[PDB]
Design a protein. Structure first.
Lengths: 148, 60, 125, 155, 85, 49, 116, 134
RNA sequence: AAACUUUCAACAACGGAUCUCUUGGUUCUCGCAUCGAUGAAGAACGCAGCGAAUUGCGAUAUGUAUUGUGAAUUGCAGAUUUUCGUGAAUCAUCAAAUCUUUGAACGCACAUUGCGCCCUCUGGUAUUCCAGGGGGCAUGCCUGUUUGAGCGUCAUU
């Protein structure tokens, strides 16, 4: 045991690891099933996008604060200002996130405009009868990217 | 002398013999064969000849 | 191949064939139909059946023809009248023949053979 | 969990592809790696995009016939034989060589048309992999390009 | 004579025919199968016994019912009958 | 034994009838390998229960 | 021998008589069986007995269904065997049944479609 | 406490595990009550329980149980969920309230070593995960 | 010199290597979610014209019904004409049934084909006895049910 100027490897195989080995041969074939299930959503959903429209948010910490990023959902401030309800925002595919709060006017404007551009770019199908479709754009994030 | 179904009492036989052949059974003696089927040995009363009723049923 | 609901696996195919049930086997025992008949019926090949009418085309028995007693779906063969080995004792045994050799020349007609033909895309009876 | 798939550097791979598409030119490289390309009127063999239209196999073979293959398509036909292995009983029962490779930019049935022809591996330029361009790691598969594809290599 | 002669004295039966697995492994001075732990309700079976799962699982036997569920699932638990074409 | 149980006699009744050889007409079946019966139990050689 | 569709028409008293006619012929056969090497007739006649018995039962059971049609609690054999799980698990009425709060909510806010 | 059964205290093994006595069954007393009534009242489905009383000898627990067979439940959607087959013996699996505490299932930093599930996170983080390309 | 021993040949043994095969495995991927008191899994004994095993099934026993297919099955024997047909088949399918004795196993037992009791019907002079046919009788818990129990406790003659 031990040896020549050779660095101290810490390796963790003293337990029965060879029972719990997981090799992702699937990887390549899983992808398929994801692509295929994303498509099956898109047909099932039909005109809508696969994704709900998500807001912009500044990542936490010293390390990442400089970066901006896509958060969970939109806040009952940013929605109310953009002129709708959280109850209804959900029906039009805006991610509402109750538990985020809003202490930066220069982030809200980023979002409020983002909601205003969304409510613009989408059309809503009347519930009553006619549904004049204009294809599906599959992602919101495609059409509404998080430019820093 | 019959082969009989297992799960068949000596009453059940007497009745079936009497019912099929319109015979008066004096007395049944069953047994169970090593092969694993019952075998009745049914006696008919004085009046009924076994010999004729044997060629009546079929087996001479 | 192109679809994903079909196998280039030999090992599976052979299993299927040798284990296939009579219902399937009937199909696998198609004989082609003659150069004469094909023009009449527009049908290259039918499943071979009990009434036979058949010119053997490959083997020692090629040229010779006949009717048939029985299709041996269990040996995938079709026994044929006249086409016989003779054992040393003088008794006559039927030769086995695989149908795709054998060529049908005077089909047996039935509602269900007509219907099959009409279903397969065949003019006339 | 033994290492089956082996990572390669994207860049190395490209290098190697490029370097295979070098070899697609130069007859010397192409003639060594099989290919009856003595009847052909010089290589970097591009063909019009009229072949790109082709629908049926009959017309695709008729293109190759007149272009300068057929010495290659006879190759892949005569060459077929049983494997010399147990691989016979693992779904590799027969072998046969690689014929040319029809690169193209666009598909209006080329893929379908060449499909059944026993040598011809079609392939997009978009992909154009070293598995198809330098098989057996023998540089210089005889590529039949299209006027579209061959234009698109610069891009 | 702990051997050939004391084997002589082997002429009884610790065990007999267990109801439940028809093994000759029904102890009697204990009233219970060593094999299948009848008359207790579960089958006396263990993980450590890898093979002796294999010797008695679903499929070792007939599966008079369960041979034919897969079908009934596949046809979607139909009821009634077919008619004609 | 003589003074036997019925669940015993029934299992012997099985094992008497089982012991009989391979009936010579299976030998002629198409796709048959069974030249002779393996499962065949002389009363001395091998016991039962 | 006997065809199902021919039995289906016959009455309950007719079938019992028919069954007895077969069970005699079966009996006379098994007497002839022991005096002859091969007796293959026996198989087809033993099917008939079944044919009949099946036809008898099938009529009986459709007739029981005929009485219990409508009312709750038909006999266990005349419910759908399905598979315990399903036969226990909530019926498409139940589960889809939604509390009155959640009904309202749905009506005011159903997932409206929307492009782009 | 739980007494480690072992004949006579003969634990056999590393003196660490010679401990027989001061030993504390990790499922509460609440749960054990819910569990014991579960097996008694097999048709019922435990829903929750609550403490009543105790003394020297015993804790006492009032256990509330619900009948998924019964219709008043099965129809009315407020309870109807409990009739699903993934609530058969919630008490045994530790899907009861006591169960989830005793499993150590809160959010946060004070509950890493169990959160999804103790034997889960372990079996996630005691796994060698190998890709195609390594 | 022969015999013998040894070596080596051809031919012959023994033996089953090698080669070639391959309805088996094998790992990998994908899809699905479906046992059981409506008796599961398992077992036992049976059942085929000629079966010992296997395969299938349960006294309707290598099957019945239904549907499809459209003439087989095939070792022999054998039918049956059903072969311009509501129809061959060790065919597929499968939604109707049968499903012996068991088995969680459930009347109580169970090294026993033991021992009951109840309802109903048919035999024997029969409400009670015997016998035969049918249908029952497990435990827990749950919701109700009726019948009750406790000066636990309220209000009345």
């Amino acid at each position: 045991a031990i040896s020549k100027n050779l660095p101290i490897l810490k390796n963790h195989f003293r337990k029965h690891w060879q029972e719990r080995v997981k090799v992702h041969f699937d990887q390549a074939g899983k992808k398929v099933s994801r692509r295929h299930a994303r498509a099956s959503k898109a047909a099932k959903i039909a005109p809508r996008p696969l994704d709900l429209l998500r807001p912009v948010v500044r990542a936490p910490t010293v390390k990442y604060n400089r970066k901006v990023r896509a958060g969970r959902g939109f806040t009952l401030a940013e929605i109310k200002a953009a002129g709708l309800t959280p109850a209804y925002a959900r029906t039009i595919g805006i991610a509402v996130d109750h538990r985020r709060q809003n202490r930066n006017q220069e982030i809200l404007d980023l979002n409020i405009q983002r909601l205003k551009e969304y409510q613009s770019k989408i059309i809503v199908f009347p519930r009553k009868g006619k549904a004049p479709e204009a294809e599906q754009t599959l992602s919101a994030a495609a059409s509404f990217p998080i430019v820093q | 002398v019959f082969k009989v179904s297992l799960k068949a009492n000596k009453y059940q036989i007497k009745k079936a013999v009497k019912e099929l052949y319109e015979v008066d059974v004096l007395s049944v003696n069953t047994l169970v064969r090593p092969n694993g089927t019952k075998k009745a040995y049914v006696r008919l009363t004085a009046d009924f000849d076994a010999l004729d009723i044997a060629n009546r049923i079929g087996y001479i | 191949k192109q679809s994903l609901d079909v196998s280039s696996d030999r090992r599976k195919a052979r299993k299927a064939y040798f284990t296939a049930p009579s219902s399937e086997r009937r199909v696998l025992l198609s004989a082609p139909l003659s150069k004469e008949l094909r023009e009449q019926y527009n049908i290259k090949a039918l499943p071979i059946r009990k009434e036979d009418e058949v010119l053997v085309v490959r083997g020692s028995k090629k040229g010779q023809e006949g009717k048939v007693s029985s299709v041996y779906r269990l040996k995938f063969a079709v026994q044929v009248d006249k086409l016989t080995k003779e054992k040393s004792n003088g008794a006559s045994v039927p030769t086995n023949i695989h149908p795709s050799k054998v060529v049908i020349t005077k089909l047996h007609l039935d509602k269900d053979r007509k219907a099959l033909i009409q279903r397969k895309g065949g003019k006339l009876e | 969990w033994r290492k089956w798939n082996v990572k390669v550097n994207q860049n190395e791979k490209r290098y190697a592809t490029a370097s295979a598409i070098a070899a697609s030119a130069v007859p010397s490289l192409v003639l060594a790696r099989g290919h009856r390309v003595e009847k052909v009127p010089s290589i970097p063999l591009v063909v019009s995009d009229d072949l790109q239209s082709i629908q049926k196999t009959k017309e695709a073979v008729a293109a190759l016939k007149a272009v300068g293959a057929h010495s290659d398509v006879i190759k892949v036909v005569k060459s077929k034989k049983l494997r010399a292995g147990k691989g016979k009983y693992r779904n590799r029962r027969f072998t046969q060589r690689r014929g040319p490779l029809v690169v193209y930019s666009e598909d209006n049935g080329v893929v379908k048309a060449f499909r059944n022809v026993p040598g011809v591996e079609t392939a997009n330029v978009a992909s154009l992999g070293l598995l198809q361009l330098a098989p057996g790691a023998h540089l210089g598969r005889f590529v039949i390009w299209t006027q579209s594809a061959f234009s698109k290599l610069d891009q | 004579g702990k051997g050939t002669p004391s084997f002589g004295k082997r002429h009884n039966k610790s065990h007999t025919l267990c109801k439940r697995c028809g093994r000759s492994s029904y102890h009697i001075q204990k009233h219970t199968c060593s094999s299948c732990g009848y008359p207790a309700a579960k089958m006396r079976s263990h993980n450590w016994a890898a093979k002796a799962k294999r010797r008695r699982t679903t499929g070792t036997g007939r599966m008079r019912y369960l041979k034919h569920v897969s079908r009934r699932f596949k046809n979607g638990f139909q009821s009634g009958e077919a008619k004609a074409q | 034994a003589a003074q036997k149980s019925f669940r015993i006699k029934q299992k012997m009744a099985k094992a008497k009838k089982q012991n009989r050889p391979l009936p010579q007409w299976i030998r002629l079946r198409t796709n048959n390998t069974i030249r002779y019966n393996a499962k065949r139990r002389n009363w001395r050689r091998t016991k039962m229960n | 021998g006997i065809k199902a569709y021919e039995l289906r028409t016959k009455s309950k008293d007719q079938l019992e008589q028919q069954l007895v006619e077969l069970k005699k012929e079966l009996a006379e056969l098994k007497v002839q069986k022991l005096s002859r090497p091969s007796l293959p007739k026996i198989n087809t006649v033993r099917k008939n007995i079944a044919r009949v018995l099946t036809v008898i039962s099938q009529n009986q059971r459709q007739a029981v269904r005929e009485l219990y049609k409508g009312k709750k609690y038909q006999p266990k054999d005349l419910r759908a065997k399905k598979t315990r799980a399903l036969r226990r698990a909530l019926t498409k009425f139940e589960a889809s049944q939604v509390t009155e709060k959640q009904r309202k909510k749905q009506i005011a806010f159903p997932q409206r479609k929307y492009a782009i | 406490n739980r007494k480690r059964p072992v004949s006579k205290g003969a634990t056999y093994g590393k003196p660490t595990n010679q401990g027989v006595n001061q030993l504390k069954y990790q499922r509460s007393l609440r749960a054990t009550a819910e569990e014991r009534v579960g097996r008694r009242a097999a048709n019922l489905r435990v829903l929750n329980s609550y403490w009543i009383n105790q003394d020297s000898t015993y804790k006492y627990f009032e256990v509330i149980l619900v009948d998924p067979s019964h219709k008043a439940i099965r129809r009315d959607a407020k309870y109807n969920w409990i009739c699903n087959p993934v609530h058969k013996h919630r008490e045994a699996r530790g899907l009861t309230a006591t169960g989830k505490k005793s499993r150590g299932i809160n959010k946060g930093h004070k509950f890493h070593n169990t959160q999804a599930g103790r034997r889960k996170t372990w079996k996630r983080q005691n796994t060698l995960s190998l890709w195609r390309y390594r």
